[PDB]
Amino acid sequence: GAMGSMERASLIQKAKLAEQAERYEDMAAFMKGAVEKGEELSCEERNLLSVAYKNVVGGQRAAWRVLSSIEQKSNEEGSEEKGPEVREYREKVETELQGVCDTVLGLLDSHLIKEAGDAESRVFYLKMKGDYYRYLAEVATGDDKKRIIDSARSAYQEAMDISKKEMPPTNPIRLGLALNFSVFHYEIANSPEEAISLAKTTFDEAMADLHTLSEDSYKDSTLIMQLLRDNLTLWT
C-alpha cells in the first residue's frame, strides 16, 4: 500500500483536508490507508470513509448512466452504426466502478465487519456492504447478477435485524439503512410494494419516537425522515 509509510493520524488529517478541497479520490485513498493500519475506526473515521467512497462511486454511477443511455439509443431502430466505441467506454467506466466497489467490500471483509461489535459500527458497515453490492447490481448483467442482488439483500437484512434490536427507531444510521434498503427493494429487487411499506413503517415509527430527542438529535432524525417522505411521494 502506497499509504503504508504514512502515520494513521496523518492519513485522517489529510482525508479531512481532501474533503475541504473536494478531492474525493484522494480522500478515499487516505481513508483506505487508515483502514489498512488495522485498528478499528471511530464514528468520525467511519463517516470519513463512507463520505469519500460515496462521492467517488457516485460520480462513476452518474457517468455510467450517461454512457448507458447513449448506448441504449445507439441500439434503437434507425440509429446509425457508430462502432464499438460507446460500448468500450461504458465498459471502461463500469470496470472502474466495479473496482471501487470491490475495494470497499474488501476493506469491509478485511477486517472491519468482523471486528465491529457495537451496533453503531456493525450496522454502519453492513449498510455499506449492502450499498456497494447494490452498486454492483446496478451494472450487473451476467450469470452472477442474482447472487450479487442476494449479497446486497443479505447484508441489508443483517443490518436491519441488528438495528431493530439495538437502536431506537430515530437513530440516523437505522433510518438511513431503511431508506437505502427501501430503494434496493424498489430499484433492484423489483419489489415496489416492499419498498413503500418499509419507507412508511420506518417513517411512522420514527415520528412516534421524536418526543424523546434533544433539539440536535431531532434535526438529525427529521432530515432522514424527510428523505423517506420524498421517496414515498415519488412512488405514490
Binding site: L179, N180, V183, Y186, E187, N231
Partner: peptide, 5 residues
C-alpha cells in the same frame, strides 16, 4: 432517482 444516504 430516489434518495439514498
Amino acid at each position: 432517482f430516489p434518495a439514498t444516504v
